[PDB]
Design a protein around this nucleic acid. Sequence first.
DNA 1: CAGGCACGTGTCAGATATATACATCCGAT
DNA 2: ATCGGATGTATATATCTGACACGTGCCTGGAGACTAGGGAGTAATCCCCTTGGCGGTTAAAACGCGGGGGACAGCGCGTACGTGCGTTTAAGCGGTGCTAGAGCTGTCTACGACCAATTGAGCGGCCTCGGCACCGGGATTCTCGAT
DNA 3: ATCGAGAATCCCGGTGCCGAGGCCGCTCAATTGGTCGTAGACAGCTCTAGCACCGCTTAAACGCACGTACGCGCTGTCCCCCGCGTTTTAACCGCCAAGGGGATTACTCCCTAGTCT
Lengths: 80, 80, 97, 97, 108, 103, 93, 91
Amino acid sequence: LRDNIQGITKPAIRRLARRGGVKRISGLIYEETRGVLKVFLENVIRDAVTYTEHAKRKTVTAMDVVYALKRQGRTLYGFG
Amino acid sequence: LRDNIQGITKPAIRRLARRGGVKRISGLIYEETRGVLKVFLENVIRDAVTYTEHAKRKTVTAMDVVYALKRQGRTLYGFG
Amino acid sequence: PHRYRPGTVALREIRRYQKSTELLIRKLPFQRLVREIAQDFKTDLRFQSSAVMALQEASEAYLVGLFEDTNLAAIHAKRVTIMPKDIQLARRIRGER
Amino acid sequence: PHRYRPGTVALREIRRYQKSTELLIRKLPFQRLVREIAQDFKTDLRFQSSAVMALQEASEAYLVGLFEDTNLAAIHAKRVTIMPKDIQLARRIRGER
Amino acid sequence: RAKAKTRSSRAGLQFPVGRVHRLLRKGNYAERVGAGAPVYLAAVLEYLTAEILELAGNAARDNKKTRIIPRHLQLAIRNDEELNKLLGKVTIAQGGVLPNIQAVLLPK
Amino acid sequence: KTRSSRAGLQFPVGRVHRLLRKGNYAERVGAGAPVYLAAVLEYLTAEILELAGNAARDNKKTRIIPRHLQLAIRNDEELNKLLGKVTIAQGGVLPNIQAVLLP
Amino acid sequence: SRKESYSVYVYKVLKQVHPDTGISSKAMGIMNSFVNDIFERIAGEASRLAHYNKRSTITSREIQTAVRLLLPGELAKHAVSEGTKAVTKYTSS
Amino acid sequence: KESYSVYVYKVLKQVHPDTGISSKAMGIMNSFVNDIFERIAGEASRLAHYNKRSTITSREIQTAVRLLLPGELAKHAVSEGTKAVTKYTSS
DNA sequence: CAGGCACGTGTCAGATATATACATCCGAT
DNA sequence: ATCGGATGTATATATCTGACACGTGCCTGGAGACTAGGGAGTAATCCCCTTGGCGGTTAAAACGCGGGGGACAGCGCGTACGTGCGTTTAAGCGGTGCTAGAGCTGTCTACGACCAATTGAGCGGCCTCGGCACCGGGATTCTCGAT
DNA sequence: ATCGAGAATCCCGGTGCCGAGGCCGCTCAATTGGTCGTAGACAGCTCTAGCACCGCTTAAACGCACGTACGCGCTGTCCCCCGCGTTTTAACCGCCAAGGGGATTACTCCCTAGTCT
């Protein structure tokens, strides 16, 4: 898998900004948002994969993601 | 114990801003800073007094302040 | 032909996407991006669907909050259009830089 | 006589207090303020000297960090002077508001 | 012997007391657990749940809905100030955001 | 005899084992866990002391003060991330002035 | 296997504050996450509270102080009154 | 009381055989050690409960080190931790 | 059983005061 | 650019001084042996849940074309904030007393751990009709080019 | 400062869907009833440090004068982002199939808690 960061299309970032309450969006916002999303995703997935590996498992369950998020103070409700 | 919030003089706030790397200061900062400092002090001292009262003590030890700060995410090194 | 003035449709979209709770990022592209990112840490991983859904929801909430802080930073600078400097300032103040 | 240009002495004392490691706040007024705040929660309450010193260090560090964030916010708006709107923006972004 | 009457019924609570006591004992929180601690904790948890559900039902009726959805929990938590501060670092699945548009963006 | 010397460390394996036992962290504590934790603590202390000693020598001093510890922590890429939310008493602040304020 | 949840307990509380209001599976699993979150939050603070005073037991006094630390303002004042009311009733059967 | 004063000073003499340490700076070193101790041990305690285990072993301390410490710092801490355990088992 | 913690003690790294050299700012020029 | 005057920084030397690092005694926390039992490693198995592929629909993304509104640069003004000087206030700093209360010991007693019956409450399986999603059309309200 | 054409939005009704809630069977974990070790509650004593007071000295705070430079309002340029129409295109739904490993139970063995020195 390569260049899947471009799967986060400009309309998706536009909709996220609209939900965040942004009226006008600059052209350079999309690339910055893709980079920030990538950094956040690596940060969460590193801990999730660590939790999965410690359990001698090969599947990343939802509880691993929940624990990884809770470690960084995000504390997601819902799943698990 | 009355009006001791004014004990935090203007030059003290200027000195703190200079340590923070601030060049110019407006006149309303000397009151906004007192307000935010009062809020922070109330928030910390409430928990410190709660710990002291739970410990069946009438003296607020430094360890209570350390625990109260560690509860708010502001870990402090040097006092225990 | 009737053409709406630029401000109106943006605000309409704002209200529409603030009223709802759907996921705004597509699901297969996000799943492919998650798998790509996870290849670096351990090869041949089998993601459970609920884990991908939780990742998408957490990332979307983070992006919405970051865009809110970016919007406030933009308004602080006597502006309406958000710029990458606004995102940088928000992340720096939040403690992510 | 001679008069320094505005900002040069202001650029100084930044270089002093960023190298100095003093408290910069008078100790007895801070002690009185702490006692006044604390009497609301419990009367006839006694304080340790180390407790007041720890409170002073923590308060000063918090204020210094808030002033750095305020400076960043003020520079973001193409300004050199800091206004209370910058403090409010920094506190709002940091999650205190 | 005697008729078994559950500890949650002796305290008037709806949340379990035996379950909370078991979780406290098997949670490695302390060597020993007192008798009144599970009762107090169950009462506190029941109060918090009732307080949230009150506002959640209020939000549900305000939308002409009979059932509670995560949007109603999101609205109830964010509208109340103390619940907002309690759960300020919590993301609720399928909850959305509070409608809020800045005044400068509003059209002249 | 001592477990610290048997593992080649300077931090106390026995004291860490006792703190783990009284800690209430878990019902049982393994044999290698205190050794591993003592090794990690020793490594972290050694890194702090290296950076603090360098910072102290850069200031023509032969003794470590909290200012040197604060400078060492803030001037390291990863030690700053590890102790970002930590306040050091009598540590001061890192000297830094924004370029816009400079004339 | 036999999974444990607060679904029965949350539903009973719902039927007394709002007798004619239901709840969905999605919404109810969030209420299960909330209760488990607060349970670990209060018990963790009480566990640290006993260790600070070199104690070995978690009593209602430790739980009361942890509630006063974690819950804000009026939310703590009402919770303490609810907690003490149950203990007195329990102590007198 | 009990502290790490003897142990911290020994580590300094290996790292800087001439540099010393003041009383207030060295108490900060003590508070740092207990802070990191509770971070790793607290995280490891959650790992046992998460996996329904009842024992804390070297596998839980190692994972807790990777979770807390950043990238390059954690890699050497694992290497130092692994080295000590192998030597301890052999001797 | 011995190492680590109270307790006591010599002593030198560091703070302070004073004189001297000097990198830097500012008004004309 | 530039050149001298004049402040505020570095630097060297004398001169104390009080924490720092090192002996010294001692006792309690760490070590070595031995025993027993339950936690966990290992084997084997079932099914379920993840992955891979294919086919058709179509809503969403990509692209192009105005064009108007917001970002940005430049100008001018006035007023608020620095910089300096004289005056006043109170913060350290040194002593004294004085007693409330943190801290350490000694009983002993109620309280929590623990084990053997006992049984009812919560969980898994399985309906079923009603709340809610969707569509189709009409009435209502907001917007924008025109007076 | 209004006015009507046009587009977006709310509402009212009708229809179908699937899951929220209720019921039934059944375990196993909560309950009772006892014993018994010990954690800490209480009484008592000690010393110590936190509080209060007084006197002196001088460093810092305060108030004022004054200049100036920077924050703010205004105006002009222009460029770039938004609205809208047309053309791909790949997400999504439905369906099928295969096998990898995630939970389970049995068996055993040896690692760690406990006690003594």
